[PDB]
Design a protein around this ligand. Structure first.
Ligand SMILES: [Zn+2]
Ligand SMILES: [Zn+2]
Length: 684
RNA sequence: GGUUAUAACUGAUAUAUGGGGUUACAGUUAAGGCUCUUUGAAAAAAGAGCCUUAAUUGUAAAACGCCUAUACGGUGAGGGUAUGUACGUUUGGGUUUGUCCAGCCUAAACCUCUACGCCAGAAAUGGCACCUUCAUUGUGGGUUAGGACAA
DNA sequence: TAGAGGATCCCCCCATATATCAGTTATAACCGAATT
DNA sequence: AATTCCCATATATCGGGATCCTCTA
C-alpha cells in the first residue's frame, strides 16, 4: 500500500468513487453514490414564491397609498365594500390592480402601463378633476417601493490579495494596453471598445497592469451553484465516512467532461472551428432581436405583428415537465399565444405553428422541434452535460482541505481513454443498472501500462476480493441514496394552491384542458362531466392526455369570454384527508408536515396506546381537533429511526408516521415497504 | 500543460415587476332543481324564497411565527449631494432555533478596496432621485415555502 | 369488526427586464517545467 | 538548447401522506 490512488467519476446525477493501489492494481473500495437532483427545482420554486410574495406586498403598499390620497382629494371609502362609491375614484382603484408593464417603450390581460395610464387619465378627466390630481395618481402608479440594486453585487476577490476586483466597464483603458505589449490579431482590440464587458478581472488594479506574469496559482472558484455545491458535498460526505478513516490518499484523478456544449447544443457533434466565434444570436443583437429576425418581426403562432415591447421567448418544449433554455426552443409569442400555451406541449396545446413562417426559417433544428416538440428528448444535448462539466473546481480544494496534503497532484482523464481499457480488459458498459459507475471509477484509478505488443497488458487487471477480477453485481456494496427530508424547518408548511372546504368536502376549480383523461369522475357537475367523457371518446384520446385548444373549442368547452377562451370546472381533490387541512386567514391549504412523530404511552386501563404528534407550528391552524397524549410517554418514534418488530430481529427504517407506521429494511426487501402498528413495534 | 484576455455556448443563483391560475366574501346574469303564494275545474303559467352548476364584476387572503414602536410610511418646509453617499470597508444585529450556515434585510463608526442611475443646457450646470434635520399626520417595516449537524 | 396488503390518488404556470460566476469550444498572448 | 504539455464518439442522461377495496383473525 505504498502508493494509493483514488478515482472519482463525476456525473450529472451519479458519481462513482473508487480507490486502488498501483502496486498490484487491487481494488480496495469501490462505491457509486446518487446525488440530489431536486435542488435546482426547489431553489427555482422558492424564488418564484418569494418573488410573488414580495410582489403582493408592493401591491398592498401601492393600493394603501392610492386609497389614502383618493380619500384626501374627496373620496369616500367604505370598509365593508372595500372600494370607493364614486365612479372616478372606483375606476382608478380598480385600474391600480393591473397597472401594466413599463420595461419597454410603446412601439389583452397585460397590455402596457401607458395604456392603463391613458385609461386612468380619461376617467379622471371625465370626472371634472384637476390635472394636479392626475399627475399625482400617475406618480403613484409609476412609484417604486423596493429599489433595484444590481450594481456592486457579488464582488470578486483578487488572486493574490483580498481587495475587491474593479468592474470591467472602468478597465477598458487597461485592457487595451494588455495587447499592445507584444507586437488576425487586429479585430480583438475592437471588441473591448464597442460592446458590453460583463465579468470581473479576477485581479486588482495594481497587479493586473504590470504583474500579469504571475502564473503560479490555480483558477480560484469562490461561487458555486447550491445544487452543484450540495452535489459535491454529498460526494465528499461519502468519502469522509469510508475513505478517510480507512485508507490514505496519495494521488487523485477525475474524469474530464469535455462535452463540447457549444457543439452539442445545435443538434450536431462538432461544427467548424471558425463557426464557434459566431453563435446563434445575430451580431450586435440580443436573443429577442435574433428571434424576431428569424420570424421577420412577426408571430409564428398567429401571424400578428410583434415588436420588442411584447416579444416573448416561448419554450416550444414546456419547462413544467422538461424544458431547456436553448436557442432552438424559443421562437415567438406575443400576448395570447404564450398565455394559451401556458407551459404545455404544442401538440397537446393544439396551437399549431402557421405553415407560412416555418418554411422561412434557416435553422434546421427549428424545423424538427416545431414539427414535433418531443424530438428534443432524442437530441444529443442534455442539462446534465453542463452539470457534469461545471463544478470540477471547488472539489479538489475541498478534497485537499479534508485530507490535508495541500500539494496534492490533480490529473484529468478523458472518457475516450477509459473506454479503450474497459473494452480491452473484458468489461461491458451497460446503460441499465447504475453499478457500472463504480467500474468507471476503478478504471480511472487503475494503472495504465500497455507494454506487450501494443495491446493492453492482462496482468494489470483490477483484482476483486482476492483475484476474481471485478464484478459489478458481486464485488460492490450498496449504492448510497441522498434524498430530501421534509421534517426540517425549511420544508414548506402546506401547498401553494388554496383549496375550498365547504360542506365538509375538499374541492377546487380546474381547467377543462387541465383535466387528465380517465379522471373526469371528480367533476361535481352532472352535465359537463358527461360532455368531457363524450369529447374524450369522440376524439379518441387515451389516458394521460389532455384536450387541445382547437378540440376544446369544437366540443363546446369555450364559453368563457365571448367564445374565445376555455372555462374551468369544480372538481374534488383526491388523495387528501381531513387531518391535512389547515386554515390560515380566509384561505385553506393541504399540509404534509402535520405529523412529526409517533408517541406511545400507557392508557388508563393499562394497555399500551399509540398516537400521532402534530406540528407545533400548525397546531392552532388545524381545521379539526387532534388527539393529544393522556398517559406517560414511554418512547417517541421519528423518521429515519432504526426499529425492530416484536417477533423479528431485522432492522427497519420508519418512513411514515401515524397509528400504522410504514417501515422498510435498510438492506434487501427489493424496495417493498412493510406496514405494522406501532403498538407491536419496538425502537432499537 | 498552466494562467489570463477576446468572442460565443449552455448551466444556475439573487433582484425588481408584468400576467394567468387558486381560495374567501359581496353583487349581477343564464340554465337546472326544491318550496310557498296565487291565476286556474283541470292542464298549465306567473310571482316570491332557497340550493346546485356555469359565466361575469368588485374587494380581499396566499405559508406559521419571530424581530422591530428607540420602529416604519404620507404631506409641507431646510440642508447635504464624488469633498458625498452605500449595494462598499470594519465590527455587529434580525430572520435564528438544539446548533451552525446559506440567501435576503439592517445598526453604529469609516472612504483602503468596489459601485454610483434617470430627465434637461450651449458651459453655468438646473430638476428628479438619494442622504439628513424639523414640524404635522398615520400604523406600519424586515425576514420566513433552502442546506447541514445534533436529538 | 379490527388491522395490513394493494391499487391509484396528491402536489403551480408563463414571461419581461437588471446584475453575476463556471464550465466547454476556438484563436492569440506569455510562463514553466519536462522532454528531447 | 529545441520541443512537449501522461500516457492515448467517451464522458453526462419527489416524499409523506391520503382514500378505497380487498383480504385476514
Ligand atoms: Zn491583488
Ligand atoms: Zn401571437
Amino acid at each position: 500500500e505504498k502508493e494509493l490512488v483514488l478515482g472519482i467519476d463525476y456525473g450529472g446525477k451519479y458519481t462513482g468513487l473508487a480507490v486502488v493501489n498501483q502496486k498490484n492494481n487491487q481494488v480496495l473500495y469501490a462505491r457509486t453514490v446518487k446525488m440530489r437532483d431536486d435542488v435546482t427545482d426547489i431553489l427555482a420554486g422558492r424564488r418564484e414564491q418569494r418573488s410573488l410574495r414580495r410582489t403582493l406586498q408592493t401591491k398592498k403598499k401601492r393600493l394603501r397609498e392610492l386609497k389614502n390620497y383618493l380619500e384626501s382629494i374627496g373620496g369616500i371609502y367604505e370598509e365593508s365594500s372595500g372600494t370607493f362609491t364614486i365612479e372616478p375614484f372606483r375606476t382608478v382603484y380598480s385600474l391600480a390592480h393591473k397597472r401594466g408593464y413599463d420595461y419597454a417603450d410603446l412601439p389583452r390581460n397585460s397590455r402596457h402601463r401607458d395604456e392603463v395610464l391613458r385609461d386612468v387619465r380619461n376617467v379622471m378627466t371625465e370626472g371634472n378633476l384637476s390635472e394636479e390630481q392626475i399627475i399625482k395618481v400617475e406618480s403613484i402608479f409609476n412609484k417604486q417601493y423596493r429599489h433595484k440594486r444590481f450594481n456592486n453585487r457579488i464582488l470578486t476577490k483578487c488572486k493574490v490579495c483580498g481587495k475587491n476586483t474593479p468592474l470591467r466597464i472602468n478597465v477598458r483603458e487597461l485592457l487595451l494596453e494588455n495587447i499592445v505589449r507584444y507586437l488576425w490579431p487586429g479585430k480583438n482590440l475592437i471588441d473591448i471598445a464597442r460592446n458590453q464587458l460583463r465579468g470581473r478581472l479576477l485581479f486588482c488594479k495594481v497587479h493586473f497592469p504590470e504583474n500579469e506574469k504571475y502564473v503560479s496559482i490555480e483558477k480560484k472558484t469562490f461561487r458555486l451553484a447550491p445544487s452543484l455545491k450540495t452535489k459535491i458535498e454529498n460526494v465528499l460526505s461519502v468519502i469522509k465516512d469510508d475513505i478517510l478513516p480507512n485508507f490514505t490518499l496519495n494521488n487523485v484523478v477525475m474524469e474530464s467532461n469535455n462535452f463540447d456544449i457549444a457543439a452539442k447544443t445545435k443538434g450536431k457533434k462538432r461544427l467548424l472551428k471558425e463557426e464557434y466565434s459566431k453563435g446563434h444570436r445575430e451580431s450586435g443583437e440580443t436573443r429577442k432581436e435574433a428571434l424576431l429576425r428569424e420570424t421577420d418581426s412577426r408571430c409564428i403562432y398567429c401571424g400578428k405583428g410583434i415588436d420588442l415591447s411584447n416579444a416573448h421567448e416561448d419554450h416550444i418544449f414546456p419547462r413544467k415537465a422538461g424544458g431547456i433554455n436553448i436557442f432552438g426552443n424559443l421562437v415567438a409569442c406575443c400576448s395570447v399565444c404564450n398565455e394559451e400555451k401556458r407551459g404545455r406541449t404544442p401538440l397537446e396545446s393544439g396551437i399549431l405553428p402557421k405553415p407560412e413562417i416555418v418554411s422561412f426559417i434557416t435553422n434546421d433544428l427549428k424545423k424538427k422541434i416545431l414539427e414535433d416538440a418531443q424530438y428534443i428528448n432524442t437530441l444529443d444535448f442534455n442539462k446534465y452535460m453542463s452539470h457534469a462539466s461545471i463544478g470540477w473546481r471547488h472539489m479538489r480544494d475541498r478534497l485537499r482541505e479534508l485530507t490535508g496534503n495541500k500539494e496534492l497532484l490533480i490529473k484529468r482523464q478523458s472518457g475516450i481513454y477509459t473506454a479503450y481499457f474497459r473494452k480491452w480488459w473484458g468489461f461491458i458498459k451497460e446503460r441499465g443498472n447504475h453499478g457500472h459507475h463504480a467500474l468507471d471509477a476503478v478504471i480511472l484509478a487503475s494503472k495504465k501500462s500497455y507494454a506487450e505488443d501494443g495491446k493492453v497488458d492482462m496482468t494489470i487487471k483490477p483484482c476483486g476480493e482476492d483475484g476474481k477480477e471485478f464484478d459489478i453485481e458481486r464485488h460492490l456494496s450498496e449504492m448510497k441514496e441522498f434524498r430530501r427530508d421534509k421534517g426540517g424547518k425549511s420544508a414548506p408548511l402546506h401547498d401553494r394552491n388554496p383549496l375550498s372546504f365547504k360542506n365538509d368536502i375538499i374541492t377546487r376549480r380546474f381547467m377543462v384542458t387541465e383535466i387528465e383523461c380517465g379522471k373526469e369522475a371528480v367533476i361535481i357537475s352532472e352535465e359537463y362531466r358527461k360532455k368531457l367523457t363524450e369529447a374524450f371518446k369522440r376524439f379518441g384520446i387515451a389516458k394521460g392526455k389532455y384536450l387541445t385548444d382547437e378540440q376544446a373549442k369544437d366540443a363546446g368547452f369555450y364559453l368563457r369570454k365571448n367564445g374565445e377562451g376555455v372555462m374551468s370546472l369544480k372538481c374534488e381533490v383526491k388523495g387528501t384527508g381531513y387531518n391535512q387541512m389547515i386554515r390560515i386567514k380566509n384561505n385553506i391549504f393541504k399540509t404534509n408536515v402535520h405529523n412529526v412523530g409517533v408517541a406511545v404511552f400507557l392508557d388508563e386501563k393499562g394497555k399500551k396506546r399509540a398516537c400521532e404528534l402534530k406540528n407545533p407550528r400548525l397546531s392552532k391552524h388545524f381545521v379539526k381537533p387532534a388527539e393529544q397524549v393522556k398517559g406517560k410517554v414511554i418512547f417517541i418514534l421519528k423518521r429515519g429511526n432504526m426499529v425492530t418488530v416484536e417477533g423479528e430481529e431485522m432492522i427497519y427504517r420508519v418512513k411514515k408516521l401515524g397509528t400504522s407506521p410504514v417501515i422498510e429494511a435498510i438492506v434487501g426487501s427489493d424496495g417493498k415497504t412493510r406496514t405494522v402498528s406501532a403498538t407491536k413495534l419496538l425502537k432499537i
